[PDB]
């Protein structure tokens, strides 16, 4: 079952072929082909035991981080955002499966920045009180970075600080920020710098 979706997405996403770079007279994919593949996968996983949507999204987010392909990654992120827009892939599930085991700080820094920019495109992450594990994992992925990384990757990694700033600022009107205080216990044991 999962291999069927795997092959379908591989035929959809990895539709590129080494084709004699010399120019042919032949001459959108990011607007029509992406939507067609999204709708096909939508019908599939809607008729493919949606109970396993967690494992499906895990497979998808794993495959996304496989291609180095900075520009191709950004296109897949827009595809995933549009698939969120159609009422599919609830935000809590997709972000909880995207943050863990896939952010990979310093492994794919460009993918880190693009992932957190996608999360910022869904910065609201409109859901129930289940934003707790998201914030906890974000703080964990932030703290697993020492204080002497570099001075060339600062803004590329600052997407984490941007997301946290949006969360805390909107917490005046988005969610009970006392829940954020009780969720950030991991960083402050009554004050530890």
């Amino acid at each position: 079952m999962e291999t069927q979706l795997q092959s379908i997405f591989e035929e959809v996403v990895k539709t590129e072929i080494i084709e004699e770079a010399f120019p042919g007279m032949f001459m959108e994919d990011e607007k029509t082909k992406l939507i067609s593949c999204l709708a096909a996968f939508r019908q599939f996983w809607s008729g493919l035991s949606q109970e396993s949507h967690e494992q499906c999204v895990q497979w998808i987010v794993k495959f996304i981080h496989g291609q180095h392909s900075p520009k191709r990654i950004s296109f897949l992120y827009d595809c995933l955002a549009m698939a969120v827009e159609t009422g599919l892939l609830p935000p809590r599930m997709v972000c909880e499966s995207l943050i863990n085991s896939d952010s990979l700080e310093w492994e794919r820094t460009q993918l880190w920045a693009l992932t957190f920019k996608l999360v910022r495109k869904i910065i609201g992450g409109v859901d129930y009180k289940g934003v707790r594990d998201l914030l906890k994992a974000i703080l964990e992925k932030i703290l697993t970075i020492p204080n002497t990384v570099s001075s060339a990757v600062v803004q590329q990694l600052l997407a984490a600080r941007e997301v946290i700033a949006y969360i805390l600022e909107r917490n005046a009107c988005l969610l009970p920020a006392y829940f954020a205080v009780t969720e950030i216990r991991k960083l402050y044991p009554e004050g530890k710098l």
């Binding site: 001075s151 600062v154 530890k192």
Partner: protein
């Protein structure tokens, strides 16, 4: 050792209001010895705080911002050519030192040394704390009734350092038009970018 132990005691707070009150009373307790204590403290600790490796571990705290605020306050206060003759310090301050490197003066030279260290702290490819520290220091230095940023018409690095920091909007407008010289054209162009 006085200022060193005071800073060591200050860098153990881990609370915003604590650090704010701490620096607010430190600026006062430094009185009656403004020039000498200011010069010594700045030109000794701030380099040692920004040049070592264990010193970086202590400045990553929010106390860092309060320390930068205290430093710029002492600098701006000591720049004023007031008497400040204490009762028992007017005599015990009869010493000699070339300071081991406008005009040639101890405070005048100590400020230039600090500005040069600031510009070198924008030395990229490795920094986590002491880029954040200088960013907080410049933001605190952004204030009215400012007499720092010495600004001689010839070659002074402070505006080159300002352009470098801008590379790293009203902050550029701070040292925008100081001498009204073609030097201001440089920062103007860099702000236009």
């Amino acid at each position: 050792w006085f200022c060193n132990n005071l800073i060591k005691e200050l860098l153990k707070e881990t609370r915003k209001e604590h650090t704010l009150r701490a620096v607010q009373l430190l600026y006062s307790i430094f009185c009656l010895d403004m020039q000498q204590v200011t010069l010594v403290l700045l030109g000794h600790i701030l380099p040692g705080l920004l040049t070592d490796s264990s010193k970086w571990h202590s400045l990553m705290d929010p106390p860092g911002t309060a320390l930068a605020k205290l430093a710029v306050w002492c600098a701006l206060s000591s720049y004023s050519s007031h008497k400040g003759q204490a009762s028992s310090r007017q005599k015990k301050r009869h010493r000699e030192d070339i300071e081991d490197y406008n005009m040639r003066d101890p405070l005048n030279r100590v400020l230039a040394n600090l500005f040069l260290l600031i510009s070198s702290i924008l030395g990229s490819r490795t920094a986590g704390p002491h880029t954040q520290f200088v960013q907080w220091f410049m933001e605190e230095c952004v204030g009215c009734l400012e007499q720092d940023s010495r600004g001689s018409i010839l070659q002074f690095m402070p505006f080159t350092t300002v352009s470098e920091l801008v590379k790293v909007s009203p902050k550029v407008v701070l040292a925008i038009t100081d001498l009204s010289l073609p030097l201001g054209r440089q920062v103007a162009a860099k702000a236009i970018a």
